[PDB]
């Protein structure tokens with residue numbers, strides 16, 4: 001397999017993989033982003049995310065005829081105390097393609113991106129019940145991040161943003 | 168007062184304000200970013216954060232002689248299900264300058280940035296004990312975001328990123 005940066009032509013596959021992950025989490029209907037959205041947000045003049053994809057040889061394409069079997073979606077964030085961070089948002093390899101080393105190589109590639117960008121750390125969320133991914137990550141040096149303990153996450157949605165923008 | 172995007176010349180003030188906020192939270196020694204860091208990460212060819220600052224007339228500069236009395240530090244993030252988000256990281260107005268409407272105007276400006284960028288929401292963290300800021304935000308339409316419930320935050324620091332990058 002090959003791990004490489006996605007191109008505008010991979011948007012179809014990125015959305016397909018985003019939906020497979022959402023389905024793995026039983027929330028596929030949550031995905032309202034379109035292929036056009038991904039193209040615009042990812043390969044327009046200012047990318048709001050970056051993506052690496054895992055591509056297999058044609059001989060081994062999926063039953064559906066797709067060459068992309070995994071991906072990682074990330075973007076850079078900033079911490080006022082320490083600086084640049086690489087934030088890994090989505091990370092998924094199709095069932096039939098797991099345990100082959102694809103996820104490990106994607107993480108190695110992300111690590112190189114982090115060092116090239118001089119990020120001091122890579123941050124990400126893992127579901128509490130997912131011991132297999134927790135072990136995967138921790139075997140590669142991850143540790144718990146307590147930074148948000150004692151803090152509540154809030155959102156101000158479009159309706160209210162528009163109200164404030166025009167008050 | 169004037170709310171405006173920061174310029175490279177404001178880096179000194181941004182670091183000063185970052186430290187005042189850290190001090191308000193009794194963790195000022197946590198701040199290891201330098202002025203040079205902020206200049207490089209914020210006004211170099213690729214900004215890793217954006218900043219708005221609140222500037223007062225010279226007649227009303229701080230006892231230390233500074234014109235900048237508040238700021239908001241933010242960057243854009245991405246959610247694979249809904250797209251673009253505006254993430255507000257730091258938000259602080261100096262004590263003697265609070266309750267004058269500076270924070271409200273900074274949030275209005277951020278809201279305009281969110282709509283201009285077509286972000287569907289603005290996300291941010293607030294300390295559990297800070298009822299005053301919680302009320303401030305909620306009066307302006309904020310609501311709890313449950314997206315991370317059942318999830319653990321993890322980090323892979325530079326040491327381990329370097330190890331994986333070179334394995």
Ligand SMILES: CC(C)(COP(=O)(O)OP(=O)(O)OC[C@H]1O[C@@H](n2cnc3c(N)ncnc32)[C@H](O)[C@@H]1OP(=O)(O)O)[C@@H](O)C(=O)NCCC(=O)NCCS
Nearest residue numbers: 091092093097098099100101102103104105133135136139
């Ligand atoms: C691991 C994951 C993140 C993607 O990666 P992946 O391609 O399966 O994983 P890798 O093949 O590199 O394998 C990791 C392992 O395979 C085993 N492995 C790796 N290469 C192997 C090979 N060539 N032969 C046999 N076993 C191998 C190892 O035991 C490592 O397990 P370890 O976790 O105990 O250290 C996958 O669980 C995925 O999509 N999982 C479901 C979604 C998910 O949990 N995502 C992250 C958070 S929501």
Ligand SMILES: CC(C)(COP(=O)(O)OP(=O)(O)OC[C@H]1O[C@@H](n2cnc3c(N)ncnc32)[C@H](O)[C@@H]1OP(=O)(O)O)[C@@H](O)C(=O)NCCC(=O)NCCS
Nearest residue numbers: 258259260264265266267268269270271272300302303306
């Ligand atoms: C509000 C905060 C975020 C910055 O903003 P600010 O300039 O003080 O606030 P504003 O002046 O726009 O005032 C908000 C209020 O002032 C009062 N107010 C606003 N303009 C006013 C005026 N001209 N005259 C009198 N009262 C006024 C209102 O009651 C509003 O309170 P409300 O919160 O109940 O809706 C400030 O608390 C700050 O730095 N706080 C400490 C750090 C912090 O908590 N940061 C966020 C998270 S770590």
